[PDB]
Amino acid sequence: GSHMEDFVRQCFNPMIVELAEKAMKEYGEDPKIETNKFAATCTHLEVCFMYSDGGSKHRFEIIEGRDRIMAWTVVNSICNTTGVEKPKFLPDLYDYKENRFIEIGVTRREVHIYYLEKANKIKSEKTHIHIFSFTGEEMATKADYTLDEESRARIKTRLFTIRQEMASRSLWDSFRQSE
Ligand SMILES: COc1cc(CCNC(=O)c2[nH]c(-c3ccccc3F)nc(=O)c2O)ccc1O
Ligand SMILES: [Mn+2]
Ligand SMILES: [Mn+2]
């Protein structure tokens, strides 16, 4: 019973919490011990959901928040339909408007450091990368931030609200020095 766990359950939406619990357990991990990663998984989930909520109704296909098999199954259907190459690592969304997959990232370092980390992991110059930070910064591939400034601003605001709430409970320091 950690403070972080009870904060995550109060700060985040119940479906998002349930989805982060499944996702960690599927990879042999307990939201009750690795609670800093519990909070991070919820954060990454919410950001992905607000992101798809930006733009038009049929614009995005949500890959994050499914189980491994069904997620991949949809990645196929997208590839064997649009001709886009099959990514080596599971992405977060697919853009039907731009015809490309999106890897969303949420970092407690510089967006510089962390995009470099992921851009080297995925290597493929097809999958679009978009980064958010808890300080309000953002960095996307080819400076193509995909969404409206207003939609990205809402995400940035929510990320800073989570930081303040974590800090007022003294959990922020441990959360930052954990990534
Ligand atoms: C790292 O171990 C895990 C790995 C997986 C497989 C799929 N992974 C993602 O889809 C993912 N995961 C994270 C993330 C993970 C832990 C802590 C902070 C994070 F931001 N960021 C992303 O951008 C992202 O796209 C499922 C749960 C995990 O616990
Ligand atoms: Mn993902
Ligand atoms: Mn991601």
PDB file of C-alpha atoms in Angstrom, residues 9-179:
ATOM      1  CA  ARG A   9      -6.333   5.428  -8.582  1.00  0.00           C
ATOM      2  CA  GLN A  10      -7.652   8.874  -7.622  1.00  0.00           C
ATOM      3  CA  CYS A  11      -5.882  10.894 -10.332  1.00  0.00           C
ATOM      4  CA  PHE A  12      -6.645   8.655 -13.321  1.00  0.00           C
ATOM      5  CA  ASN A  13      -9.857   7.355 -14.860  1.00  0.00           C
ATOM      6  CA  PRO A  14     -10.994   3.848 -13.807  1.00  0.00           C
ATOM      7  CA  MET A  15     -10.880   2.397 -17.333  1.00  0.00           C
ATOM      8  CA  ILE A  16      -7.372   3.816 -17.842  1.00  0.00           C
ATOM      9  CA  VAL A  17      -6.288   2.342 -14.501  1.00  0.00           C
ATOM     10  CA  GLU A  18      -7.735  -1.057 -15.413  1.00  0.00           C
ATOM     11  CA  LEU A  19      -6.004  -0.915 -18.797  1.00  0.00           C
ATOM     12  CA  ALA A  20      -2.627  -0.074 -17.252  1.00  0.00           C
ATOM     13  CA  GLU A  21      -3.060  -2.948 -14.787  1.00  0.00           C
ATOM     14  CA  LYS A  22      -3.684  -5.451 -17.591  1.00  0.00           C
ATOM     15  CA  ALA A  23      -0.790  -4.104 -19.664  1.00  0.00           C
ATOM     16  CA  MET A  24       1.746  -4.428 -16.844  1.00  0.00           C
ATOM     17  CA  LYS A  25       0.527  -7.852 -15.698  1.00  0.00           C
ATOM     18  CA  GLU A  26       0.665  -9.108 -19.291  1.00  0.00           C
ATOM     19  CA  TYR A  27       4.397  -8.305 -19.121  1.00  0.00           C
ATOM     20  CA  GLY A  28       4.986  -9.842 -15.689  1.00  0.00           C
ATOM     21  CA  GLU A  29       4.765  -6.722 -13.518  1.00  0.00           C
ATOM     22  CA  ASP A  30       2.720  -5.606 -10.551  1.00  0.00           C
ATOM     23  CA  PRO A  31       1.143  -2.138 -10.269  1.00  0.00           C
ATOM     24  CA  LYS A  32       1.548  -2.474  -6.489  1.00  0.00           C
ATOM     25  CA  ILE A  33       5.368  -2.716  -6.388  1.00  0.00           C
ATOM     26  CA  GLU A  34       6.446  -0.870  -9.556  1.00  0.00           C
ATOM     27  CA  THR A  35       4.136   2.044  -8.792  1.00  0.00           C
ATOM     28  CA  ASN A  36       6.189   4.735 -10.536  1.00  0.00           C
ATOM     29  CA  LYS A  37       5.767   2.682 -13.685  1.00  0.00           C
ATOM     30  CA  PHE A  38       2.104   2.231 -12.775  1.00  0.00           C
ATOM     31  CA  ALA A  39       1.658   6.014 -12.880  1.00  0.00           C
ATOM     32  CA  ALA A  40       3.649   6.286 -16.111  1.00  0.00           C
ATOM     33  CA  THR A  41       1.606   3.623 -17.907  1.00  0.00           C
ATOM     34  CA  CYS A  42      -1.615   5.420 -16.959  1.00  0.00           C
ATOM     35  CA  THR A  43      -0.162   8.739 -18.135  1.00  0.00           C
ATOM     36  CA  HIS A  44       0.935   7.289 -21.478  1.00  0.00           C
ATOM     37  CA  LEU A  45      -2.509   5.707 -21.840  1.00  0.00           C
ATOM     38  CA  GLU A  46      -4.430   8.934 -21.193  1.00  0.00           C
ATOM     39  CA  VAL A  47      -2.195  10.954 -23.529  1.00  0.00           C
ATOM     40  CA  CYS A  48      -2.768   8.387 -26.283  1.00  0.00           C
ATOM     41  CA  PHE A  49      -6.521   8.662 -25.705  1.00  0.00           C
ATOM     42  CA  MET A  50      -6.598  12.473 -25.752  1.00  0.00           C
ATOM     43  CA  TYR A  51      -4.383  12.382 -28.860  1.00  0.00           C
ATOM     44  CA  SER A  52      -6.844  10.191 -30.767  1.00  0.00           C
ATOM     45  CA  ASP A  53      -9.599  12.442 -29.412  1.00  0.00           C
ATOM     46  CA  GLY A  54      -7.857  15.276 -31.225  1.00  0.00           C
ATOM     47  CA  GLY A  55      -8.710  15.658 -34.870  1.00  0.00           C
ATOM     48  CA  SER A  56     -11.609  14.030 -36.661  1.00  0.00           C
ATOM     49  CA  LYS A  57     -13.827  11.143 -35.599  1.00  0.00           C
ATOM     50  CA  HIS A  58     -12.600   8.394 -37.954  1.00  0.00           C
ATOM     51  CA  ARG A  59      -9.071   9.801 -38.110  1.00  0.00           C
ATOM     52  CA  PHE A  60      -7.096   7.521 -35.780  1.00  0.00           C
ATOM     53  CA  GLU A  61      -6.967   3.807 -35.073  1.00  0.00           C
ATOM     54  CA  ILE A  62      -6.068   3.197 -31.428  1.00  0.00           C
ATOM     55  CA  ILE A  63      -3.441   0.476 -31.017  1.00  0.00           C
ATOM     56  CA  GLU A  64      -2.398   1.235 -27.434  1.00  0.00           C
ATOM     57  CA  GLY A  65      -4.718  -0.098 -24.763  1.00  0.00           C
ATOM     58  CA  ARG A  66      -5.367  -3.429 -26.465  1.00  0.00           C
ATOM     59  CA  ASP A  67      -3.813  -6.769 -25.628  1.00  0.00           C
ATOM     60  CA  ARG A  68      -0.730  -7.834 -27.582  1.00  0.00           C
ATOM     61  CA  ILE A  69      -2.457 -10.221 -29.991  1.00  0.00           C
ATOM     62  CA  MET A  70      -5.441  -8.056 -30.955  1.00  0.00           C
ATOM     63  CA  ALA A  71      -3.235  -4.961 -31.167  1.00  0.00           C
ATOM     64  CA  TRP A  72      -0.912  -6.690 -33.639  1.00  0.00           C
ATOM     65  CA  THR A  73      -3.906  -8.121 -35.530  1.00  0.00           C
ATOM     66  CA  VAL A  74      -5.127  -4.578 -36.219  1.00  0.00           C
ATOM     67  CA  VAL A  75      -1.604  -3.466 -37.198  1.00  0.00           C
ATOM     68  CA  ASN A  76      -1.677  -6.185 -39.845  1.00  0.00           C
ATOM     69  CA  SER A  77      -5.124  -5.249 -41.204  1.00  0.00           C
ATOM     70  CA  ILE A  78      -3.872  -1.665 -41.539  1.00  0.00           C
ATOM     71  CA  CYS A  79      -0.713  -2.786 -43.358  1.00  0.00           C
ATOM     72  CA  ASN A  80      -2.372  -5.391 -45.614  1.00  0.00           C
ATOM     73  CA  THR A  81      -4.881  -2.590 -46.503  1.00  0.00           C
ATOM     74  CA  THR A  82      -2.812   0.590 -46.910  1.00  0.00           C
ATOM     75  CA  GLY A  83       0.406  -1.092 -48.057  1.00  0.00           C
ATOM     76  CA  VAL A  84       2.332   0.598 -45.239  1.00  0.00           C
ATOM     77  CA  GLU A  85       5.247  -1.497 -43.987  1.00  0.00           C
ATOM     78  CA  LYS A  86       4.783  -3.652 -40.883  1.00  0.00           C
ATOM     79  CA  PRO A  87       6.513  -1.919 -37.934  1.00  0.00           C
ATOM     80  CA  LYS A  88       9.002  -3.941 -35.922  1.00  0.00           C
ATOM     81  CA  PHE A  89       7.625  -2.645 -32.601  1.00  0.00           C
ATOM     82  CA  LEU A  90       3.982  -2.163 -31.632  1.00  0.00           C
ATOM     83  CA  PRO A  91       2.982   1.493 -32.228  1.00  0.00           C
ATOM     84  CA  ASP A  92       0.345   3.563 -30.404  1.00  0.00           C
ATOM     85  CA  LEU A  93      -1.933   4.889 -33.177  1.00  0.00           C
ATOM     86  CA  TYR A  94      -2.384   4.913 -36.924  1.00  0.00           C
ATOM     87  CA  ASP A  95      -3.254   8.080 -38.838  1.00  0.00           C
ATOM     88  CA  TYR A  96      -5.770   7.451 -41.614  1.00  0.00           C
ATOM     89  CA  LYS A  97      -5.363  11.084 -42.706  1.00  0.00           C
ATOM     90  CA  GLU A  98      -1.557  10.939 -43.015  1.00  0.00           C
ATOM     91  CA  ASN A  99      -1.259   7.170 -43.701  1.00  0.00           C
ATOM     92  CA  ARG A 100       1.351   6.504 -41.026  1.00  0.00           C
ATOM     93  CA  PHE A 101       1.726   4.939 -37.597  1.00  0.00           C
ATOM     94  CA  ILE A 102       2.416   7.097 -34.540  1.00  0.00           C
ATOM     95  CA  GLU A 103       4.613   6.355 -31.526  1.00  0.00           C
ATOM     96  CA  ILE A 104       3.563   8.569 -28.621  1.00  0.00           C
ATOM     97  CA  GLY A 105       6.084   9.244 -25.877  1.00  0.00           C
ATOM     98  CA  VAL A 106       5.803  10.883 -22.470  1.00  0.00           C
ATOM     99  CA  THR A 107       9.077  11.724 -20.747  1.00  0.00           C
ATOM    100  CA  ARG A 108      10.606  13.118 -17.570  1.00  0.00           C
ATOM    101  CA  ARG A 109      13.840  13.944 -19.426  1.00  0.00           C
ATOM    102  CA  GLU A 110      14.495  16.290 -22.319  1.00  0.00           C
ATOM    103  CA  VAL A 111      12.328  15.534 -25.353  1.00  0.00           C
ATOM    104  CA  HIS A 112      15.715  15.576 -27.099  1.00  0.00           C
ATOM    105  CA  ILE A 113      17.154  12.633 -25.140  1.00  0.00           C
ATOM    106  CA  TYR A 114      14.031  10.531 -25.332  1.00  0.00           C
ATOM    107  CA  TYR A 115      13.089  10.928 -29.003  1.00  0.00           C
ATOM    108  CA  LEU A 116      16.683  10.006 -29.850  1.00  0.00           C
ATOM    109  CA  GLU A 117      16.229   6.868 -27.735  1.00  0.00           C
ATOM    110  CA  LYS A 118      13.050   5.833 -29.555  1.00  0.00           C
ATOM    111  CA  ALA A 119      14.106   6.966 -33.033  1.00  0.00           C
ATOM    112  CA  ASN A 120      17.093   4.623 -32.724  1.00  0.00           C
ATOM    113  CA  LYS A 121      14.944   1.757 -31.425  1.00  0.00           C
ATOM    114  CA  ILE A 122      12.426   1.960 -34.264  1.00  0.00           C
ATOM    115  CA  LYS A 123      15.015   3.042 -36.891  1.00  0.00           C
ATOM    116  CA  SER A 124      12.313   2.823 -39.585  1.00  0.00           C
ATOM    117  CA  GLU A 125      11.787   6.297 -41.062  1.00  0.00           C
ATOM    118  CA  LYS A 126       8.085   5.527 -41.652  1.00  0.00           C
ATOM    119  CA  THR A 127       6.644   5.415 -38.126  1.00  0.00           C
ATOM    120  CA  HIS A 128       5.945   8.960 -36.954  1.00  0.00           C
ATOM    121  CA  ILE A 129       7.185   9.882 -33.473  1.00  0.00           C
ATOM    122  CA  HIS A 130       5.551  12.474 -31.210  1.00  0.00           C
ATOM    123  CA  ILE A 131       6.938  13.350 -27.786  1.00  0.00           C
ATOM    124  CA  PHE A 132       5.413  15.100 -24.789  1.00  0.00           C
ATOM    125  CA  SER A 133       7.138  16.097 -21.552  1.00  0.00           C
ATOM    126  CA  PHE A 134       5.851  16.993 -18.096  1.00  0.00           C
ATOM    127  CA  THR A 135       7.412  20.457 -18.530  1.00  0.00           C
ATOM    128  CA  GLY A 136       5.276  21.364 -21.558  1.00  0.00           C
ATOM    129  CA  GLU A 137       7.765  20.583 -24.323  1.00  0.00           C
ATOM    130  CA  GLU A 138       6.978  18.490 -27.385  1.00  0.00           C
ATOM    131  CA  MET A 139       8.864  17.170 -30.408  1.00  0.00           C
ATOM    132  CA  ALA A 140       7.527  15.319 -33.447  1.00  0.00           C
ATOM    133  CA  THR A 141       9.114  13.858 -36.563  1.00  0.00           C
ATOM    134  CA  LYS A 142       9.812  16.390 -39.346  1.00  0.00           C
ATOM    135  CA  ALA A 143       8.315  19.000 -36.986  1.00  0.00           C
ATOM    136  CA  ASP A 144       4.972  17.534 -38.119  1.00  0.00           C
ATOM    137  CA  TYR A 145       3.001  17.669 -34.874  1.00  0.00           C
ATOM    138  CA  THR A 146      -0.034  16.094 -36.590  1.00  0.00           C
ATOM    139  CA  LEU A 147      -2.708  17.757 -34.441  1.00  0.00           C
ATOM    140  CA  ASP A 148      -3.982  21.261 -33.806  1.00  0.00           C
ATOM    141  CA  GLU A 149      -2.028  23.443 -31.400  1.00  0.00           C
ATOM    142  CA  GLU A 150      -5.121  23.483 -29.179  1.00  0.00           C
ATOM    143  CA  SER A 151      -5.298  19.686 -28.924  1.00  0.00           C
ATOM    144  CA  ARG A 152      -1.594  19.403 -28.092  1.00  0.00           C
ATOM    145  CA  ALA A 153      -1.877  22.235 -25.559  1.00  0.00           C
ATOM    146  CA  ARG A 154      -4.619  20.366 -23.678  1.00  0.00           C
ATOM    147  CA  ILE A 155      -2.321  17.338 -23.402  1.00  0.00           C
ATOM    148  CA  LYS A 156       0.539  19.528 -22.163  1.00  0.00           C
ATOM    149  CA  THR A 157      -1.721  21.136 -19.550  1.00  0.00           C
ATOM    150  CA  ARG A 158      -2.879  17.740 -18.269  1.00  0.00           C
ATOM    151  CA  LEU A 159       0.733  16.554 -18.053  1.00  0.00           C
ATOM    152  CA  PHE A 160       1.696  19.545 -15.930  1.00  0.00           C
ATOM    153  CA  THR A 161      -1.355  19.083 -13.697  1.00  0.00           C
ATOM    154  CA  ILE A 162      -0.263  15.497 -12.998  1.00  0.00           C
ATOM    155  CA  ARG A 163       3.192  16.789 -12.043  1.00  0.00           C
ATOM    156  CA  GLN A 164       1.835  19.367  -9.580  1.00  0.00           C
ATOM    157  CA  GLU A 165      -0.504  16.803  -8.012  1.00  0.00           C
ATOM    158  CA  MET A 166       2.391  14.358  -7.677  1.00  0.00           C
ATOM    159  CA  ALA A 167       4.632  17.088  -6.249  1.00  0.00           C
ATOM    160  CA  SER A 168       2.086  18.247  -3.660  1.00  0.00           C
ATOM    161  CA  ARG A 169       2.126  14.632  -2.413  1.00  0.00           C
ATOM    162  CA  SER A 170       5.971  14.546  -2.509  1.00  0.00           C
ATOM    163  CA  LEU A 171       5.805  11.662  -5.014  1.00  0.00           C
ATOM    164  CA  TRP A 172       7.189  13.728  -7.902  1.00  0.00           C
ATOM    165  CA  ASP A 173      10.867  13.481  -6.933  1.00  0.00           C
ATOM    166  CA  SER A 174      10.765   9.681  -6.856  1.00  0.00           C
ATOM    167  CA  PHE A 175       8.766   9.685 -10.102  1.00  0.00           C
ATOM    168  CA  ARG A 176      11.312  11.829 -11.952  1.00  0.00           C
ATOM    169  CA  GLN A 177      14.369   9.953 -10.631  1.00  0.00           C
ATOM    170  CA  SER A 178      12.933   6.631 -11.796  1.00  0.00           C
ATOM    171  CA  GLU A 179      12.663   6.872 -15.584  1.00  0.00           C
TER     172      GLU A 179
END
